[PDB]
UniProtKB/Swiss-Prot annotation, chains A, B, C, D, E, F:
Native source species: Equus caballus (Horse)
CDD domains with a match to the protein in the record: Ferritin
Recorded GO MF terms: ferric iron binding; ferrous iron binding; iron ion binding
Quaternary structure and partners: Oligomer of 24 subunits. There are two types of subunits: L (light) chain and H (heavy) chain. The major chain can be light or heavy, depending on the species and tissue type. The functional molecule forms a roughly spherical shell with a diameter of 12 nm and contains a central cavity into which the insoluble mineral iron core is deposited. Interacts with NCOA4.
Keywords of the record: Acetylation, Cytoplasm, Cytoplasmic vesicle, Iron, Iron storage, Lysosome, Metal-binding
Its job: Stores iron in a soluble, non-toxic, readily available form. Important for iron homeostasis. Iron is taken up in the ferrous form and deposited as ferric hydroxides after oxidation. Also plays a role in delivery of iron to cells. Mediates iron uptake in capsule cells of the developing kidney. Delivery to lysosomes by the cargo receptor NCOA4 for autophagic degradation and release or iron.
Annotated Fe cation binding sites: 53, 56-57, 60, 63
Residues carrying N-acetylserine: 1
Cellular location(s): Cytoplasmic vesicle, Autophagosome; Cytoplasm; Autolysosome
Region of interest called Catalytic site for iron oxidation, as start-end residue ranges on this chain: 53-60
Protein's name in the database: Ferritin light chain
Length: 173, 173, 173, 173, 173, 173
């Protein structure tokens, strides 16, 4: 078997493949979120762009994990990608809540894999995750929390008007 | 009669002239919509510009149909242009509803003429319509539906304030 | 009624709306003239461009009148637009004669409205017309008279050849 | 047989090869027309350039059909190219009449092939023709009709002088 | 239901959602193909880049279909994405064969949807497919057939050496 | 008859027309060679480009002969163009052999026409041929012989691999 593989456990290899699946599932969820907000009857362009941008980020995450798998001499294995949890995502507030739940599940999977690398004394894996994933997730989750707070503040006031204003003055269009 | 005319039915020729009339009538409607929103007592500049831009688009549509009529060896015939359906157009919401009704009637006339070209085996006509009209209308109708949704969301909240915000933050001024 | 309206008679307001109708009717006439000269069996491109340019000028005239109506606190009212007086416009000479008749009728309507503003002591109206319409019409009518004379001189000589030469060497293509 | 071929009938394949032959024959006809007008005893440079340009266009047409044949997995088959219908082409008027007859025969062959693709449910073929051939032919035929009308108008007047003027002031040199 | 929806059958709407699923499945297949050729024990960089580029193209295809679904007033519905048909893809020749099979299945789904639009008299759908999908697929399938032929020619000769040469001199790296 | 014609024999005039036919036939042969190498099942792009370039060169040759015919006061006469000698052209080696045979037949026709001009004391004809044709043919034939030798050397070794390498490293793509 692999001429290059060194200090790379089968446990980490398998967990990397599961993490790829989770990032691709997250990408798919954000594809559905983005297009929902592009519906003529929802029509929040800045919200659509925010979630489409995230779909791209998550796919890049997956590709970065697949590159690393190959660099370490593991073998990429792909599984079915489960469809997103909803067909319709409600308001900007419901959507951003669903997004933060999703990100925290990714984050926990990152932290789990880090703990696994630490238990296996795999410092390349730990650095890979620290360098490309853990800080990015923390920053994103904070940004989503900031958004949450602003949406909440706006839609407690007047729901339709608040949602419009958030999309126009916070989100990029 | 025409030295150039080939595979161009009198049925299509007549329907092209009717379509020109419909596009010019639509142009005229958008001229009246634009100037209504320029009244001192309505004063929504972005709304006026949106409908004046559409008046231009519809006239360009007509001119493109007239050019094609001549390219195929048909004879342009002009009829009276009926005045717009209203003298006053209500709110931005009433106006945008009237506009979408209008666009869908144009779209249906396009689809009718396409079906006629298909029944007459006139593939130049079908391509002409597909290339310059059918996609443009679908895109415009979607944009108007997006606008509808945003206006509705805003004016359900607080009517005057919502209309102002839409004009300032969505429409071009 | 109007918060801005000052020294603006209902007589002038109504006459402005009639003048808008006349300018739009003139625009439409020039649209039909232009496309007639684009027929494969007429094919005088410079003549088509001359009349299409005039269609644009007359529409701009109307829009300028509508802008002013709103600036003075009057209310734009649109009426049916009668179709052009002919379906076919004969030779370049017949067409240019029809155009000069048309321009002189516009000019007379301008002069009538000026006399009305003067009788109503409406010096903004009189200046508006002097500044944007009366000189433009005089210049255009002169240009059309110049064209008339040159066409006449050419087609008295040899009709087909003369018409060709005028289009090629006087008109823009 | 072909690893790529999909939804591509032998009927269309054969008709594409016939159409290639017709476009190459048309190219050849325009080569002979161009050089006829370059004779010292005909000497109408703008006429020669107009027909040589068309020889190029028709060859490009053929090459575009051959490219498509290969893209669909058909097999290009070439046949003898019949010589042009005349050795001498008369006046600019006779020539332009012969050219329009030729173009209408190409156009009819295009329309026939389109009807064949439609009967075979071959929408790639129909789009290929619509996109690259049907509009180009309609535009060319119109241009030739415009030219016809202008030549006729000029040579009814005075034949030699008219032909000279057309070549100098309409055609490119 | 939809304020914009016009001439858009539930049959087409559903088939568009299935086509989106097929394009995303194809994207996923090309992701697995690309990373397989990035393995240390396969190591054909140009092959990896070719299939990763295709993964991008197919995702863009899906996004373009989702955009259109929304433009027509249909509702995007996402389903599970089945994993690729293989975990390991053999030689460059085996891979390129699998790719052409895949493309032809996409192409057939496009042709099926086109036939459905034609039966439903939905000319916007037919033009959408013709303009953005049918020609692209035909061109891609031809390119893959060209590649097939060259790989075959090379690996019949000497398998390892041939595969290397193809990757170095035909594929982009 | 011709006001310009001087020292131009009917024998040369006729032979010039035959030479035009031979150059156009050669052009056509190279059109068929080029597209054969564009087939999905042959797929040698550099070979296709080499022969298409030659199709252009031969047509330019013909046009240069037709220009000269007219400059000397002869009359261009066109005949049927016989189809190429084969429908399928075998390997790059078979094709390049067929091309060199073809070029040598053109060259011999050039040399024959030169001998005819020399016997008729037509030094303009002799210079025309020397200046634009004899050196070009010698250079081309040498280039084809060089290609022959390289193809032979490569395909004696390993036929498929050799053909690929020639196309990639000698021919332009
Ligand atoms: Cl990133
Ligand atoms: Cl699921
Ligand atoms: Cl660390
Ligand atoms: Cl436009
Ligand atoms: Cl009415
Ligand atoms: Cl102006
Ligand atoms: Cl009337
Ligand atoms: Cl072209
Ligand atoms: Cl014959
Ligand atoms: Cl089509
Ligand atoms: Cl693309
Ligand atoms: Cl599966
Ligand atoms: Cl050359
Ligand atoms: Cl033969
Ligand atoms: Pt790193
Ligand atoms: Pt956008
Ligand atoms: Pt077009
Ligand atoms: Pt403005
Ligand atoms: Pt002024
Ligand atoms: Pt023009
Ligand atoms: Pt195309
Ligand atoms: Pt020239
Ligand atoms: Pt489109
Ligand atoms: Pt690379
Ligand atoms: Pt020379
Ligand atoms: Pt190329």
């Amino acid at each position: 078997s692999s001429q290059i593989r060194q200090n790379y456990s089968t446990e980490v290899e398998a967990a990397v493949n599961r993490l790829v699946n989770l990032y691709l599932r997250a990408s798919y969820t954000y594809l559905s979120l983005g297009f929902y907000f592009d519906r003529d009857d929802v029509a929040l362009e800045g919200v659509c762009h925010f979630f489409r941008e995230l779909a791209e980020e998550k796919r890049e995450g997956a590709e970065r994990l697949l590159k690393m798998q190959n660099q370490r001499g593991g073998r990429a294995l792909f599984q079915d990608l489960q469809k997103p949890s909803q067909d319709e995502w409600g308001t900007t507030l419901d959507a951003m809540k669903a997004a933060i739940v999703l990100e925290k599940s990714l984050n926990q999977a990152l932290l789990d894999l880090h703990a696994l690398g630490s238990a296996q004394a795999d410092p390349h894996l730990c650095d890979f995750l620290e360098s490309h994933f853990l800080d990015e997730e923390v920053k994103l989750i904070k940004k989503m929390g900031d958004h949450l707070t602003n949406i909440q503040r706006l839609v407690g006031s007047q729901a339709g008007l608040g949602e419009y204003l958030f999309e126009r003055l916070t989100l990029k269009h």
